[PDB]
Amino acid sequence: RHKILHRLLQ
Amino acid sequence: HMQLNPESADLRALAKHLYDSYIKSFPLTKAKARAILTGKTTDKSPFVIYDMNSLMMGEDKIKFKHITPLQEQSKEVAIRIFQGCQFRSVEAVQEITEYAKSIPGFVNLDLNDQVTLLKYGVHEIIYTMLASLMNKDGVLISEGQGFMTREFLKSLRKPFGDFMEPKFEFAVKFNALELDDSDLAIFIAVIILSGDRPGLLNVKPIEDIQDNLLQALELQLKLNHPESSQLFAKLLQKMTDLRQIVTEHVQLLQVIKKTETDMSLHPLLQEIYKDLY
Numbered sequence A: 001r002h003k004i005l006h007r008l009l010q
Numbered sequence B: 001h002m003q004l005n006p007e008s009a010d011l012r013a014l015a016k017h018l019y020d021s022y023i024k025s026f027p028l029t030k031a032k033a034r035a036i037l038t039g040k041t042t043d044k045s046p047f048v049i050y051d052m053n054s055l056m057m058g059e060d061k062i063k064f065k066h067i068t069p070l071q072e073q074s075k076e077v078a079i080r081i082f083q084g085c086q087f088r089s090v091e092a093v094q095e096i097t098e099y100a101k102s103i104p105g106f107v108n109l110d111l112n113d114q115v116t117l118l119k120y121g122v123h124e125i126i127y128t129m130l131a132s133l134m135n136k137d138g139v140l141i142s143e144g145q146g147f148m149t150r151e152f153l154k155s156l157r158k159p160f161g162d163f164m165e166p167k168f169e170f171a172v173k174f175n176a177l178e179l180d181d182s183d184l185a186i187f188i189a190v191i192i193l194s195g196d197r198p199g200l201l202n203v204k205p206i207e208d209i210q211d212n213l214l215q216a217l218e219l220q221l222k223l224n225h226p227e228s229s230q231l232f233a234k235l236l237q238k239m240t241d242l243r244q245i246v247t248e249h250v251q252l253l254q255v256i257k258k259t260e261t262d263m264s265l266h267p268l269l270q271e272i273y274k275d276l277y
C-alpha cells in the first residue's frame, strides 16, 4: 500500500 | 465574448478559495520569493552558497530545519545536500496533502483514489513550486534563509552534479510564463486531479472536479494576463513536460541507488516512487 500517504490523508 | 454570470461568479469564488488555502498550505509563496530574489523586501538577505567555502560557512550560519547538533551527517557535501532535499520533499508531501484536502470535493473521493492522485501529483507539484524559488543564478533554500547557486550544484561530483540542472532548465522556461500565486493555486489543483493517473477506480468524480478547475484556471488566465493569449494552452502543455522530468528524475534516482553506499530514501518517498513510471 502507501501506508504513510494513507495515514496523512486521515 | 466572455460575460459576468453566476457561473463565472462561482469560478472566481473557487479561485479565491484555492488561493487562500494555497497561501495557508505553503510557506514561501512566489510573491515572497520574488521579493527576496530581488532584495526588494526585508527579512531577506539570504546567505549565498556559491563555492565549497561558503557552503561550509552556510551550514554553520543557516538554521536548517533538519539540523540538530547531535545527529550524524555524511562527510560528503553532495550527500548532506541530497539529504536536505529529502527532508524538504517529505515536508512538501504534507503541504501538498493538506492543500489537496482543501480542494472542493477531494475529501469526498475514494480514499484509495486520493492516495493515487497524491502519489503521482506531489513531484509534479514540487517542480512547479520549486520554480518559484529559482532564478537563473540559483535557488532559495531553507525557507529563504539561504541561496545556493546553480553552478555550485553543477560542480558536485557525479552523479549529484546532474540532480538539479533539469529543474533549473524547466524553471527558466516555466517562469517566463510570469505566473503569480493566484494562477499557481489553480494550476497545481488541476494537476492533483488528473483523472488519467494509473490505478484510479472512480474516475468520473475526478474528471468532474478537474473540469471545474480547468474552467476556473482559464478564467483566471484571461482575467490576469491580458498581454498573452494562449497562456492556458501553454500551461496545460507544461504538465506534459512535468511528467517527463519526473520520469527523467526517477531514472537519475536509480543511478544514485545502485552506486552510493545505502543512500536511504525516506520511507514516504519510497511509497511515492514504488511502481511509479
Ligand SMILES: CC[C@@H](Oc1cccc(CN(CCCOc2ccc(OC)cc2)c2nc3ccccc3o2)c1)C(=O)O
Pocket (backbone or CB within 6 Å): B059, B064, B080, B081, B082, B083, B084, B085, B086, B088, B089, B092, B126, B129, B130, B133, B141, B142, B148, B167, B269
Ligand atoms: C532527494 C529526493 C527528492 O529529490 C528532489 C528533487 C527536486 C527538489 C527537491 C527538494 N527541494 C530542493 C530544496 C533543497 O533544499 C536544501 C536543504 C539543505 C541543503 O544543505 C546545504 C541544500 C539544499 C524543494 N524545494 C522546494 C520549494 C517549494 C516546494 C517543494 C520543494 O522542494 C528534492 C525526491 O525525489 O523527492
